[PDB]
Amino acid sequence: TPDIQMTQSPSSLSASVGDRVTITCQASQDIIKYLNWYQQKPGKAPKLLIYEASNLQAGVPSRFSGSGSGTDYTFTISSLQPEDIATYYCQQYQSLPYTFGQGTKLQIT
Amino acid sequence: TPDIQMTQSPSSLSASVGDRVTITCQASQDIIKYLNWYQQKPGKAPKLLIYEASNLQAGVPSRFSGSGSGTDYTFTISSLQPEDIATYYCQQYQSLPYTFGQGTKLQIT
């Protein structure tokens, strides 16, 4: 069985405080809605932000949101803040092995 | 609902090539068997090694194995190899939000 390949773009981004930022993920096969988004700050374990494409988890600020279906999904930060500097990942769980996108490093200009 | 907290030990380990290495992960509540193990090399995304406590994924060397149930789980490398140097994490998926242990950094002496 071929793995499902997740393609994330862009691989790095720098923006100013208060700007809007979007990250996309595309799957090589339809995964219906089974996609998660994680945040990882340096030296730390990943933290689940959004479950099943669009369900925001507890303790996550409302300026984060997720959308999409089929093969194409989007992660949005409506107003970038300093504490948001991290690497962000998408992950599919439609089929084993679960795979991650390559990651987007976010930095402030 | 309280989160389920995962406690991983040790947080860091140094060992020689050919040694046996074990990493433990304990949950603050019974998670039955719903625990995954991931490998992460620096600058790279995590890779799923083991699903539902003991099911080894494709492409993974047979020197890796997983065991446990209830609240206590173990990850074993039967013979440490240089390509094994990475950070390893456990993750529960019995309840949302899914949580990770703090990670074990593995290095060679």
From Swiss-Prot, chains A, B:
Sections of the chain in a coiled coil: none
GO molecular-function terms, A-Z: antigen binding
Predominant localisation class: secreted
Positions of the UniProt region annotated as Complementarity-determining-2: 52-58
Region annotated Complementarity-determining-3, chain positions: 91-97
Region Complementarity-determining-1, residue ranges: 26-36
Annotated spans, Framework-2: 37-51
GO CC, alphabetical: blood microparticle; extracellular exosome; extracellular region; immunoglobulin complex; plasma membrane
Cystine crosslinks: C25-C90
Region of interest (Framework-1), residue spans: 3-25
Highest taxon of the lineage: Eukaryota
Subcellular location per the Swiss-Prot or TrEMBL entry: Secreted; Cell membrane
Alphabetical UniProt keywords: Adaptive immunity, Cell membrane, Disulfide bond, Immunity, Immunoglobulin, Immunoglobulin domain, Membrane, Secreted, Signal
GO biological process: adaptive immune response; immune response
Domain Ig-like: 4-97
Region (Framework-3): 59-90
Free-text function comment from the UniProt entry: V region of the variable domain of immunoglobulin light chains that participates in the antigen recognition. Immunoglobulins, also known as antibodies, are membrane-bound or secreted glycoproteins produced by B lymphocytes. In the recognition phase of humoral immunity, the membrane-bound immunoglobulins serve as receptors which, upon binding of a specific antigen, trigger the clonal expansion and differentiation of B lymphocytes into immunoglobulins-secreting plasma cells.
Subunit-structure text: Immunoglobulins are composed of two identical heavy chains and two identical light chains; disulfide-linked.
Protein name, per record: Immunoglobulin kappa variable 1D-33
Source species of the chain: Homo sapiens (Human)
Source lineage: Eukaryota, Metazoa, Chordata, Craniata, Vertebrata
